[PDB]
Structure formats: structure tokens, C-alpha cells
Design a protein around this ligand. Structure first.
Ligand SMILES: *C(=O)N1CCC(Cc2cccc(Oc3ccc(C(F)(F)F)cn3)c2)CC1
Ligand SMILES: *C(=O)N1CCC(Cc2cccc(Oc3ccc(C(F)(F)F)cn3)c2)CC1
Ligand SMILES: [Cl-]
Ligand code: NA
Ligand code: NA
Ligand code: NA
Lengths: 543, 541
């Protein structure tokens, strides 16, 4: 498996598809703009989604108008960002079908590429998934459609969706719309760049280690990673199936938190619960989302794993003080044994099989630089990860731990690990209740890392991963931008470890003046309405 | 060395003896102060009327409690279903929140439901002298909901037989016939509730362990969707096996009681105490619906040949449902063999049984387990070899052996994904045929008293829905007539291997014993399921 002819073929074919898609969308927007030269696009594109939806519903704006305008903006912003991989087949026929009663009637929505769509590849940037169009829409696509929405594009993801950058050898590299040298985050990076530049009012990403939250934060939009099984993962393309220790979660990304709520409200209905009975039929509880009661807000300023950027620290402290000023009680709170949850529970849950199932997707394929040495490392034999870990342990403990916990195990040892994760979850919940929290405020990784560094700043996944591991709903909302003061203070940054993960992060978070910085909001499992209520408060008080 | 096991067996027996003495003394002290109390009238009150009268004040908690305690102690003489009397349930009696939906209701608990200060031995020696530090979550909510958990009921050793004997507390018997099994692993509950000793109990079910005892002892029980209720604080012997979900649920004399129990358990108390449970309240309107149902049905799973009594019970409830204006659709989940032999066995024994076998180190192995322990203990290469030797001759046994071997995490992921897809397969099937609900045979009548551990194939009617993680309930609908029992002679199974041979024999001499039918709905559809169970109940009772 060292021949690349197939991979090269797939790369050419994918590029011609994306070039063709982009042409197609160009022709359509020109045809439209000719017929509608008086349309005020800028007014329409800057409409918050709630107001867009109401005008759609009132009939004040036709779907054609909002669609081809957004399509227009998507094509335009894509020139600078390369976030659109495909234009979704007969979304224009869907445009004129969109159920008029649908809660998202006439709303264009962007999809991360793994959200399978009839007649389209979900390549994941992998060559073996090229030329394999899905035979039907995934469940959440079906409901979006049923609920009046118009999925219109597939947005780029990093190869295999297992980097928090966003390049792949098929469609290339997606860029942060705020600064071309920066990453848009990932794996939902296409979404981040698109929505964060005004090209889509609402998109859907996925998140198993922070992949909704990284791009949302890096690109200065909001996003929510619900409880794993709050929404249906049916029809989603991934590259490892049956790993249940760390739940893959999917969720909404959007310009305001109201949009996230609307999207959940829309998705959580009889259509979804019918199409996928394995999802618990938990309707969106608006009264909880709309509550304006005080909150007991747990907070931490650092997780003692990934030292926060000065920007993050300030962002956290500032939203803390504003929340306090708004009459909420802020309690110092840090989930126990984060190192354990990250180094053994998370890494071991994600790589229970040494990474072998994951590695299968790369046979014959190029490995994108933004994955870093991940593939090289997973490919190392079990005994050598062991040996290396023990040699590294006295010197570089985080790396030792990482190597040591990504080895193959028996089903017997997997059961043991899942049980530790199960109890770990219950340990943090006890902590939570003992402290009587409603909700939890935390740092979000930020600002945007430089453009090939996420795959080498491996430790920085800590702020988000922890809640994948706990399967707590966690969302992210921008609250500030990097001041020069914050940027200069990066020179005084030396992480908690001084290993190359810290060194690469240190470098990667420099030259970031003006970029958005976010804060993370966490609630207990099944409490996405509560979580959004908190996010809405944060958003309000910082915006 | 078995001296520890013998010690534990002595100590447990002392504790059970002492518990029983304690309960006797209390009932006597009560009866003296209440000689005029009509016990019989009280004991035969259905649970809904019991609760009303508790709530109205017409019956005091003391009255219903000590009466039921009395009946429990009495029926336990003939059945050996009570393991322990629960610490200051009497102090709990006088605390019971007056508002609680189960105010003053005595509740029996399978021994694995942890209770402060009590062993949850599971019949295992290593779990003796290990009192739980606190009540498990569903116990906490029962209590918060006004209920009064009063006893721990026996389970088979390790809870992995559908009989009910263990070397600590011995063997529990079917209250209808002492030579028959009460079912298991929730066999204590079956015996106790099925003889009148408890109005409402809780069991668990990973392979049919709520539904076996319920059906064998002629009561009703529900195994909801795995994560509909909190498993927090439950004692088991394998942790972190997530392929086949452990489910817990209610057992009781009528289906209304199962609904009341869910309604009571599914509330802010539970969702707070265990946020990992989806906060899905009990939807009454769905339970109470009296609209027609499209009812999928099958008479046989082509795996375990039904007893004549099962077939009759199934066909009769079918015809009654049709007469009641429900449409009955022939429907059999695809690839049951697959689901049982590879998915279920592999999910339950992903590790070759090694985690599970850890619990027996040093301990006696109860006969009602059969050769399970001996078999799991076989090396992986030999399970393989024996499998391909047996394959041409006894294919079920081959399949069983072949699928209970250790695997990599890698292969576990694969299996898990095959379970996910199989689940989706049966759901699409179900939806294709537009079913509201599914009617199924349930194993019955009760097997002879050491045969469940050797009739391993008969787990098929229940196991299937543990694998699918569908809510599945069982309701008693008839009793074995002399006709049924005689036709048992002409019974040969679908295979004629020793599992059919043992089952044929085990199900003989069963005249008058209750036979049940199984009601299944889609995931999270407990209240629909119950709605169907109520219909069945209604039309056969
Ligand atoms: C989106 O959800 N994702 C998933 C997470 C990847 C980033 C990533 C790559 C490789 C391994 C892991 O898991 C991991 C990394 C570090 C640690 C540490 F904290 F160091 F212990 C634990 N687990 C994540 C981006 C795309
Ligand atoms: C209560 O829930 N339980 C769990 C199940 C046991 C019975 C039992 C013992 C040993 C193995 C299995 O699993 C099994 C057996 C047979 C088959 C077959 F049908 F043959 F494919 C599949 N799985 C169950 C009782 C108490
Ligand atoms: Cl769930
Ligand atoms: Na460390
Ligand atoms: Na380690
Ligand atoms: Na077979």
C-alpha cells in the first residue's frame, strides 16, 4: 500500500466535482441577480436567523430570495476560505418543495461533509470514500428537509475528521475567514468558515473531541455539542463504527445562540423520533431555554492541563464578572482527575483498538499534514508504544501517557475502561450536585491556531474532550477578541509541561490580534435547553 | 479452598434467619394490637385501590405494611424467596412522604438493588459482608415517592440463570408447584409477588430475567428500554459491557401496577439523582389510549419450539385482540438465529466470560447454573475446536461455543456496530409493516427446578428484545390444561439437541401453571407497550 495513483485520481475527480459545483452555484446566482437586481442582499444576509425565518414565514421574503442570496454569499466567501466541497443536488427542487409549515421554512443550511446526502459522496477527505455517493439522506437531513429547510452545501472537513484543523488531500485546506494564516478549527471547519463569514445562517457539525466547538470558537460563531444520543447519528459517515466509549455527538453551528435553539427545537420532533426510534423522544423544552432565573455557575479559569492563552483567561474572567454582576452565583469548580479522564479514559476510548480500524481508511491514501504525526504514531506497534512510553515517562509525561493509552486491548479490558468512564461520569455528577451547580463556565481553546498546528498541539484538546468523555452537553459562544495586550502576553506563555505540545501551541496562538475568543458552557446530560439558556445569558452579557 | 464460601453461606443464612425472626416478631406485635384488621380483604386489594386507600387515609401505612410483611413471611416458608428484611424500613414507614405516588406501598427488591447497610450478595461469596454504602438511585426515588422497600428477594448465583438457587440462601421455589422453578434471575420477586407477599417489586433483565419469573409465577412484568430507568447503584458481576443493555423494571400482580410504578419512578427525583437517564416522563395519554393497534404477531421463533400451552396462549390472545378490533399482522424479526447466536452471545461474552468468571474464584458453583461455568472456563482454542467438531451435528451448541470467546476491542467495535445495524434492520421491518406493537410467545410453563441452566436455547423469546433493546413485557393469559400437558409428549424441538431434550422434559407435569404472552413495542415506547399489555390483560382476564 505505497501506490498513490488511486488517491491522485480521487483528488482530481473531487476537485472537478467541487469546481463544477462552484460553477453551478455561480450560474444560478447570476441568473437570479439578473431577475432580482433591486433585492437588498446586504440587509437580507445580516438578518439574524430568527427574523429571517419569521419573514420567510410571513411571506415578506420568498425562499428563492434568501436562498440564492445566501448561495451568492457562500460562493463569494468560499473564494477566500475553500470551505465548500459540494453543492447539494436538487436543493433547488427542494427549495420549491420545502413544507410551508416547517419551523425552518426556506432556511438554507450548510452540512459538514459527513452528513450523508442522496447522490453525494461523504469523502471525509479520504480517497476510499470518493465515488461512493450515499444512497439516501441521513436522518437529520431528512428532518431538516421535512421541517422546511434547504440543505444546500457540503462543507470541508480535515482528512478523516480527526484533526481540529481543516485540510484534506481531496479538496485541500480550508482557511479562517478572519485571517488566512489561521485554522478555521475542525473537524467542522468548513462550517465554521462558512457561517463565520456570513455564507450560511445555520449549519450542522459533529463533535467527538471538540469538533463543533473548535471551529465555532476559532471562527467566532456559536455551536452546541448536545448529549451524544439527543440527536440521531443515523446515516452519518465516519471512519470508525462501533466505538461507544466516547460518544460522537452532532449539533448546530450558527451566528447567534437563538439559532442553535431554533435548530434543536426544529430537529427534536415526531419526524426525528419516528425516523430513528433509538433516540429518546425528548422534545425541546423552551420554558427551560427561555428561563431568566439566576444560575449557580461553576467556573474554572484553567484545567491545569492546557494553560490558557491570556485571551482565554480574560474571556473567562470577564464573562464570570458580568455573570456575577447579572446576579448569578459563580462557584469555583473543577472536575476531578481531568488528567485521568483525558490521558486514559478519552485516549483509550477513542483508540481502544490501537487505532487499527481508523488506520484502515488511510491504506493507499495520502496523509494530510494537518493530521501531524498521528497516523505515523498509531501505526507504531503495541510493544513499541509501550517501550517509548516508559522511556518518555520521566521526561515528557503527557506524551508517555498518550502513547501508552492508544494500544490495542482485549474486549475484557475495553469493558473495564467503559466501566471506569461510566463511574467517572457519575463522579463528576456527584461533585456537581454536591456543589449544587445549575451549569458550568469554562475556557474554550482560542484564539485560532496557525494553519498546520492543531495536529501537533495535541494537549489543547483538553478543554473540549473532557466533556465528550463525560458526554455532557457543551456549547461555545464568542465573548471577546484578542487585544494586542493579550497577544503580547503570549510571549510569557510557557505551558504547564513545556513539552512540544505546549511549545507548538505557544507558537500557534501568536499573531492573533482581532480574532474571536470564546468561552465554553456546560450542563448535565440531557440538559441542552438549560445549556442554551446559559449560552444565551453569556451571549447577551458579552454582546 | 471453599472455607470462605462456607463461612459466607453460614453468615448469610444467619442473617436471613434473623431477618425472618425479626419480621415474625413485628407481625405478631402488630396482629396483637390489630386483631380486628381484615387482612384477606387488604392483601387482595389491587395495588391501585391499595394506594387510593393509603392516600385517602382509610388504610394506615402500618396496617398495609405489617399485613404484607405477615403474608411475605408466610409465603416465604413455602418458597424461600426472601433473603433479607430491609434495615429501618419501619422508620421509613413513618417517614414516607405523604404526597408520594406510592405512599405507604411496601415494595420488594431483587437483591442487586443496593440498600444502605445491606449486602447485595448475588449469591456470590465475595459479595458477602460487603454492605452497600447507600441506597441505589431507584430505591431512593421509591422512598422519596412514599414507597417502603421492605425485603431483598433471592436471585440465582450471579443472576445468570433463569432458575433461582444460590449456595448462600439456597433455592427459591415456584409458589404454584414446589418442583418447578420460579424463573429468574428475578425469581425471588416472582415467587413473592406471585403468592401475594408483595404488591410491587423491581427486577432486572439482561436476557429475560424480569419476564421469565413473571411468566413462570403468573404475574406481569416489564423490561423497559435499557436506559429508561437508572441502573445507578445496581450490583452486578460484569461492569462496562454495553452491547447488551441491562434493563431494570417493575413486576406486579396487574399491569396497572407496572404503569403506576413507571409513572412514579419517571420524575424529577430520578432525573436529578441520575442525569444520565433521559428525562422522559411517563406519558399517561399513550398508556390510557383505547385506539386500535396494528399488532405484529408470531406463534414461534423457529428457534425454541413453543409448548402447546404457549402456542395456545399466543393464538388465543391473537383471536381475542382481533375480536376487539385490532389488526393482527404476521411478523417475525429477521435473522433471529444471528441475533441470538452471534449478537447476543457475543455481546454478553465479548471477553470469553473471563470478567464474569472472576466472581466464582473460590466459590461453589450452584447446580442451577448448569455447565455454564465449566464451559466459559474452557480455553478459547478449545471452544473453537469443539465448535467445529459439533457444527455438523449440533449447530446451536457449536454456535454458542464459537461466539463466547475472547475478542479484541477491535472485534468488539465491529460486533457493537452489527448490533446497531441489526436494531435498525428490525426497526425498518417493523415500520415497513406499520406495526404499533408486537405480540410474541413467552417461555412457559415454568420449567422443572434445575433445568433452566441446561435449557439454554429457550432464552430465545426474551433475549431477542434485550439484543434489540426494545421494551418488552409479559402478561399471564391462561393456564396449562391437561390437553396442553399431554401434547407435550409429541413435542420435539426444532433441533433435537440436548437443549430441546431438556426443555421438553422440564416443561412436563405443568398442569394448572400460568402461561404468558409477550408484548413488545419500539424503543422508549414503554407507555405504548403497557397500553398493549393492559389490552391483553383485559381481554384474557
Ligand atoms: C473532533 O471532534 N475531533 C476529534 C478530536 C480531534 C483531535 C484529536 C486527535 C488525536 C487524538 C485525540 O484524542 C486525544 C488527544 C489528546 C488527549 C490528551 F489530552 F492529551 F490526553 C486525549 N485524547 C484528539 C479533532 C477532531
Ligand atoms: C436475566 O436477564 N438473565 C440473563 C440470561 C440468563 C440465561 C443465559 C445464560 C447463559 C448465556 C445466555 O446467553 C445466551 C444463551 C443462549 C443463546 C442462544 F439462544 F442459544 F443463542 C444466546 N444467548 C443466557 C438468565 C438470567
Ligand atoms: Cl440514551
Ligand atoms: Na501527566
Ligand atoms: Na499512562
Ligand atoms: Na444455527
Amino acid at each position: 500500500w505505497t501506490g498513490r495513483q488511486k488517491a491522485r485520481g480521487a483528488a482530481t475527480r473531487a476537485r472537478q466535482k467541487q469546481r463544477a459545483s462552484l460553477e453551478t452555484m455561480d450560474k444560478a446566482v447570476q441568473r437570479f441577480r439578473l431577475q432580482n437586481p433591486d433585492l437588498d442582499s446586504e440587509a437580507l444576509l445580516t438578518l439574524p436567523l430568527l427574523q429571517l425565518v419569521q419573514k420567510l414565514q410571513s411571506g415578506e421574503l420568498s425562499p428563492e430570495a434568501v436562498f440564492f442570496t445566501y448561495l451568492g454569499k457562500a460562493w463569494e466567501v468560499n473564494k477566500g476560505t475553500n470551505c465548500v466541497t459540494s453543492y447539494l443536488t436538487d436543493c433547488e427542487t427542494q427549495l420549491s418543495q420545502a413544507p410551508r409549515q416547517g419551523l425552518l421554512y426556506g432556511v438554507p443550511v450548510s452540512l459538514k461533509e459527513c452528513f450523508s446526502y442522496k447522490g453525494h459522496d461523504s469523502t471525509l477527505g479520504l480517497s476510499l470514500n470518493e465515488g461512493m455517493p450515499s444512497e439516501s439522506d441521513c436522518v437529520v437531513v431528512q428532518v431538516l428537509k421535512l421541517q422546511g429547510a434547504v440543505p444546500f452545501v457540503h462543507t470541508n472537513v480535515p482528512q478523516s475528521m480527526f484533526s481540529y484543523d481543516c485540510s484534506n488531500p481531496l479538496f485541500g485546506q480550508t482557511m479562517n475567514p478572519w485571517k488566512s494564516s489561521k485554522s478555521p478549527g475542525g473537524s467542522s471547519g468548513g462550517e465554521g468558515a462558512l457561517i463565520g463569514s456570513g455564507g450560511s445562517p445555520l449549519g450542522l457539525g459533529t463533535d467527538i473531541g471538540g469538533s463543533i466547538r473548535f471551529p465555532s470558537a476559532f471562527c467566532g460563531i456559536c455551536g452546541l455539542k448536545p448529549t451524544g444520543n439527543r440527536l440521531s447519528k443515523s446515516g452519518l459517515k465516519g471512519c470508525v463504527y462501533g466505538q461507544t466509549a466516547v460518544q460522537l455527538s452532532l449539533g448546530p453551528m450558527a451566528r447567534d445562540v437563538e439559532s442553535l435553539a431554533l435548530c434543536l427545537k426544529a430537529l427534536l420532533c415526531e419526524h426525528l423520533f419516528t425516523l430513528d426510534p433509538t433516540v429518546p423522544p425528548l422534545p425541546f423544552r423552551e420554558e427551560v431555554y427561555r428561563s431568566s432565573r439566576p444560575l449557580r455557575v461553576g467556573y474554572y479559569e484553567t484545567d491545569n492541563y492546557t494553560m490558557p492563552s491570556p485571551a482565554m483567561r480574560r474571556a473567562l474572567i470577564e464573562t464570570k464578572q458580568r455573570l456575577e454582576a447579572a446576579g448569578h452565583t459563580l462557584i469555583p469548580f473543577l472536575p476531578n482527575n481531568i488528567p485521568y479522564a483525558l490521558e486514559v479514559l478519552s485516549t483509550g476510548g477513542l483508540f481502544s483498538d490501537g487505532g487499527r480500524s481508523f488506520l484502515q481508511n488511510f491504506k493507499g491514501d495520502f496523509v494530510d499534514p494537518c493530521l501531524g504525526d498521528l497516523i505515523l504514531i498509531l501505526r507504531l506497534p503495541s510493544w513499541f508504544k509501550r517501550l517509548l512510553s516508559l522511556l518518555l515517562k520521566p521526561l515528557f509525561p503527557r506524551l508517555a501517557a498518550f502513547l501508552n493509552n492508544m494500544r490495542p486491548r482485549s474486549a475484557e479490558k475495553l469493558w473495564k475502561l467503559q466501566h471506569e468512564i461510566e463511574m467517572y461520569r457519575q463522579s463528576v455528577i456527584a461533585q456537581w450536585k454536591a456543589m449544587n451547580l445549575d451549569v458550568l463556565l469554562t475556557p474554550m481553546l482560542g484564539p485560532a491556531l496557525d494553519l498546520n498546528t492543531p495536529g501537533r498541539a495535541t494537549g489543547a484538546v483538553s478543554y473540549t474532550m473532557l466533556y465528550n468523555c463525560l458526554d455532557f452537553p457543551a456549547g461555545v459562544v464568542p465573548v471577546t477578541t484578542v487585544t494586542a495586550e493579550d497577544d503580547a502576553q503570549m510571549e510569557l506563555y510557557k505551558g504547564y509541561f513545556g513539552d512540544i505540545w505546549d511549545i507548538i501551541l505557544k507558537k500557534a496562538m501568536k499573531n492573533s490580534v482581532g480574532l474571536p475568543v470564546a468561552v465554553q458552557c456546560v450542563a448535565l446530560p440531557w440538559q441542552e435547553e438549560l445549556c442554551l439558556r446559559f449560552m444565551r445569558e453569556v451571549e447577551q452579557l458579552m454582546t
